[PDB]
């Protein structure tokens, strides 16, 4: 997440979709109001989202399933 983002690219699949997934996740924390799945460690929402993606807790299918569950 910091210095290098190569870890998350190999998990999402390509660079152009990682940006969209990370932005969608980060807007939830910044404005919507949600809690991180990882320790905050004094980071900005973009870096927290990248860390969550790197761990394996966030991708498109999970967000879609959660949105369906909410409604």
């Amino acid at each position: 997440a910091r210095v290098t983002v190569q870890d998350a690219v190999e998990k999402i699949g390509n660079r152009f979709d990682l940006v969209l997934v990370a932005a969608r996740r980060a807007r939830q924390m910044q404005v919507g109001g949600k809690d991180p799945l990882v320790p905050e460690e004094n980071d900005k929402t973009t870096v927290i989202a990248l860390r969550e993606i790197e761990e394996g807790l966030i991708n498109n299918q999970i967000l879609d399933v959660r949105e369906r569950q909410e409604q």
């Binding site: 910091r2 210095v3 290098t4 983002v5 190569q6 390509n14 660079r15 152009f16 990682l18 940006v19 969209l20 990370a22 932005a23 980060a26 807007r27 910044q30 004094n42 980071d43 900005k44 929402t45 973009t46 870096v47």
Partner: protein, 867 residues
């Protein structure tokens, strides 16, 4: 809310429907009282209010009156921005042609009809528009098309143009103007000055000219003047209109106060200063800054140094928000006052609001995509920007007075794009070839080269050491030399088939400096990669090998450590330059005297006729060239090796430690050709036309030139400087054309399925197919034995395997042989050179290709004067 743009000719009804007001005969703004004239070019009724929600007379000044026209003024109450929108019209008193449809290379208003341009132009200039309009309106397109088709390289164009009029829904008689549109007023404003006078645009003059001449035609019709006077005025109006539309098509250019041509409407949309190239393909932006650049040798590869005076201004809204959040201010002016007064609490907010926010840095000539890059700021004192030493070559940057610009991303998507696409830790390979772009140079090369050399009978030679740390202790204590030859116990690691690391320990013959340098090499690399003297190529090869084997993350650390060590050890050596380092061979005088004697003796064969008058020239040239080569060889043989050193009693020879020789041999700055000019002979010069001057320059730069030699040497210098100065435009124009031709080619598919390809022959074969896909059946050289399966990507291992068996030639897929329409497919392209894997979908390859071709010609330009 839209998906297309339509263009077509206009009609008088459409123009009348656009307008908000009738014709406008009066002229101007009534300079005395600034309120505009009624029914004029500037008119409140036709175009709108001069002030927001206020009438011209002033009777109504409230929002409650919105939508009410004035009875005494006739002015509606509305927002004043409508003055940018509403248009007007002028009623011409006689038909006038359109200069665009008359004057062109394929003239249109004269191709529907048979006659050529000369006679029709004679008719229009009264030597009449009514006749041409009647001829155009009194034609049948369908019957003419049928006759022409039945009759049948000169009629096909007429048939096509007639069919175009039939299909397009236009009328051939609409090419003759009847009503003139009038542009909105705020797009041609009147600008006040400090003095009483005003500054006006060129359009307001041409409108007034056309209006006055058209009104002059009006009076003649009422007075029933003879047609002789009338025919003169009709020629006048068509001369005025042609000035307003496109001035200078038929040379009659109209000027103003100065002797400079006025600018027409067609001049504001075309050219390098038109709307397209100056306001729509580029513009000026907010949140930007500019400054001079210095060097920062302590930074990490992803960092940059930013002044805090610039940072405070660049991030103002973020600071305002963070101030309002904590309650330190309530209104929007308290925060502004706090920031202006520069309190002690804003310097911590600013530190909090830049913690992980990247910025973009750009240098002015942007030749390829590596001219803009993203970094993380570090707040510094001063007014200059600090830049990492390892990113200069990609920018073509220096520290001689250069400048740079900085931009700030705003939205979350922009920040993530900057971090994931443009950050300098993602750009380590070139997109035009495969080789890396971050490479050490100069001081780093010199330092590593100095550490890794060896000497004879140095201090501490012949010891047996337990490891690199003992070597560092011995060097720091002053008990051993950096160049001593010793035995050291070394442990190294190698990867197995499953990818695990296996260790191996032994004793090796090496030097103290190499053992010291071994401590920064990552695990998984052999010891032989540093057991030699290092130059530019060796260091670049080390970096490439590390990237190939281990990956991306270790490579950044390795590069930073290399730079730190090179800077650290270059300073400790004390390398300098002096006049005694430029050694001149002792046999130069004899060689020069012998050459002079030879050329003097060859003149005896010319005083008494024995050789052609054009034959002594070549002989003299060859003699002088041979003498130059002899002198150069003697100098370089004397410089490269000079030891005469004592080894345990005896005398021995070894490579030299001359400063200039070390600088040239390490690959830091020097060249073998320039040492010749420093300490050999400058050589043969050339005349401005290109011929060779008969006698050469026999002096180097250590012993100075005289007046004649110095005067001769200036021709080439000026010629090179002029060449550099006067042909950057050729490269710029070529690059622009290349970009424009191929700007809309994108990878839009995954597999075309076609079987075609091209056959590649050896330039080695490996360098010509690394990163392609096998088009057709290719097998091992043995019969019925297959080496590589079809449709495979050839990486390093595959290339090594095929080079082991000496593969003759391979067939691969190409972009040009693809059946995909509107784009190309991934497999026909192949590898993406900037990453290593296969190409992804949605990448603009046309712009990349155009930049890759264009850039080297430009860089070739401005380096001519160095020689």
């Amino acid at each position: 809310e839209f998906d297309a743009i339509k263009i077509a000719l206009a009609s008088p009804d459409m123009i009348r429907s656009w307008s908000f007001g009738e014709v406008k005969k009066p002229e101007t703004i009534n300079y005395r009282t600034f309120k505009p004239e009624r029914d004029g070019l500037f008119c409140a009724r036709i175009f709108g209010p001069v002030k927001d929600y206020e009438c011209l007379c002033g009777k109504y000044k409230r929002l409650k009156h919105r939508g009410v026209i004035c009875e005494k003024c006739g002015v509606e109450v509305t927002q004043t921005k409508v003055r940018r929108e509403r248009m007007g019209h002028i009623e011409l008193a006689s038909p006038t042609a359109h200069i665009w449809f008359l004057k062109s290379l394929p003239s249109r208003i004269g191709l529907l009809l048979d006659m050529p341009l000369r006679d029709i132009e004679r008719v229009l200039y009264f030597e009449g528009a009514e006749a041409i309009q009647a001829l155009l309106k009194s034609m049948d397109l369908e019957q003419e098309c049928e006759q022409l088709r039945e009759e049948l390289k000169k009629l096909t164009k007429r048939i096509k143009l007639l069919e175009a009029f039939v299909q397009s829904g236009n009328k051939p008689e609409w090419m003759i103007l009847t009503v003139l549109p009038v542009l909105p007023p705020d797009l041609r404003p009147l600008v006040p000055l400090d003095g009483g006078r005003f500054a006006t645009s060129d359009l307001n003059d041409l409108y007034r000219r056309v209006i006055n001449r058209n009104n002059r035609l009006k009076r003649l019709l009422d007075l029933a003047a003879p047609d002789i006077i009338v025919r003169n005025e009709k020629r006048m109006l068509q001369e005025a209109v042609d000035a307003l539309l496109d001035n200078g098509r038929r040379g009659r250019a109209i000027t103003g106060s100065n002797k400079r041509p006025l600018k027409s409407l067609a001049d504001m949309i075309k050219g390098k200063q038109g709307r397209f190239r100056q306001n729509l393909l580029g513009k000026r932006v907010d949140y930007s800054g500019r400054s001079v650049i210095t060097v920062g040798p302590y930074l990490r590869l992803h960092q940059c140094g930013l002044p805090k005076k610039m940072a405070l201004e660049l991030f103002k809204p973020f600071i305002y928000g963070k101030l309002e959040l904590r309650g330190l201010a309530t209104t929007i002016k308290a925060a502004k006052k706090m920031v202006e007064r520069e309190e002690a609490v804003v310097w911590d907010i600013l530190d909090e609001v830049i913690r992980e926010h990247p910025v973009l840095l750009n240098r002015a000539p942007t030749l390829h995509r590596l001219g803009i890059q993203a970094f993380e700021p570090v707040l510094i004192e001063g007014k200059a920007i600090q830049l990492h030493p390892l990113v200069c070559a990609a920018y073509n940057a220096d520290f001689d007075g250069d400048q740079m610009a900085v931009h700030v991303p705003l939205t979350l998507e922009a920040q993530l794009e900057a971090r994931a696409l443009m950050m300098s830790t993602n750009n380590i390979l070139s997109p035009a070839n495969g080789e890396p772009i971050i490479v050490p140079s100069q001081d780093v090369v010199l330092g590593l080269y100095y550490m890794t050399r060896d000497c004879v009978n140095a201090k501490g030679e012949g010891m047996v050491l337990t490891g690199p740390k003992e070597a560092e202790r011995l060097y720091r204590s002053g008990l051993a030399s950096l160049h001593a030859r010793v035995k050291v116990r070394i442990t190294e690691y190698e990867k197995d088939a499953n990818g695990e690391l296996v260790a191996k320990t032994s004793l090796k013959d090496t030097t103290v400096g190499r053992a010291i340098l071994w401590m920064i090499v990552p695990k998984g690399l052999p010891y032989s990669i540093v057991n030699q003297a290092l130059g530019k190529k060796a260091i670049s090869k080390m970096l490439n090998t590390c990237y190939r084997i281990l990956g991306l993350k270790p490579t950044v650390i390795f590069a930073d450590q290399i730079m730190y060590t090179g800077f650290a050890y270059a300073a400790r050596s004390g390398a300098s330059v002096g006049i005694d380092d430029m050694v001149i061979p002792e046999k130069k005088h004899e060689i020069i005297s012998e050459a002079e004697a030879e050329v003097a003796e060859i003149q005896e064969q010319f005083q008494s006729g024995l050789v052609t008058a054009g034959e002594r020239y070549n002989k003299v040239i060859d003699i002088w060239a041979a003498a130059n080569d002899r002198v150069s060889k003697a100098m370089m043989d004397n410089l490269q090796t000079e030891t005469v050193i004592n080894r345990d009693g005896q005398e021995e020879k070894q490579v030299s430690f001359n400063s200039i020789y070390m600088m040239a041999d390490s690959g830091a700055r020097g060249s073998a050709a320039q040492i010749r000019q420093l300490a050999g002979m400058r050589g043969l010069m050339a005349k401005p036309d290109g011929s060779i001057i008969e006698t050469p320059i026999t002096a180097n730069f250590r012993e100075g030139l005289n007046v004649l030699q110095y005067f001769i040497s200036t021709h080439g210098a000026r010629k090179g400087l002029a060449d550099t100065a006067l042909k950057t435009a050729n490269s710029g124009y070529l690059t622009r054309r290349l970009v424009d031709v191929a700007q809309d080619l994108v990878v839009t598919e995954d597999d075309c399925g076609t079987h075609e390809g091209i056959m590649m022959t050896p330039e080695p074969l490996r360098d010509r197919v690394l990163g392609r896909v096998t088009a057709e059946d290719v097998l091992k050289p043995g019969t019925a034995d297959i080496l590589v399966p079809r449709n495979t990507l050839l990486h390093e291992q595959w290339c090594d395997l095929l080079e082991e068996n000496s593969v003759d030639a391979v067939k691969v897929r190409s972009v040009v042989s693809c059946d995909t329409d509107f784009g190309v497919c991934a497999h026909c392209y192949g590898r993406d050179l900037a990453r290593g894997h296969i190409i992804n979908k949605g990448e603009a390859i046309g712009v990349i290709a155009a930049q890759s071709i264009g850039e080297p010609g430009t860089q070739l330009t401005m380096r001519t004067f160095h020689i």
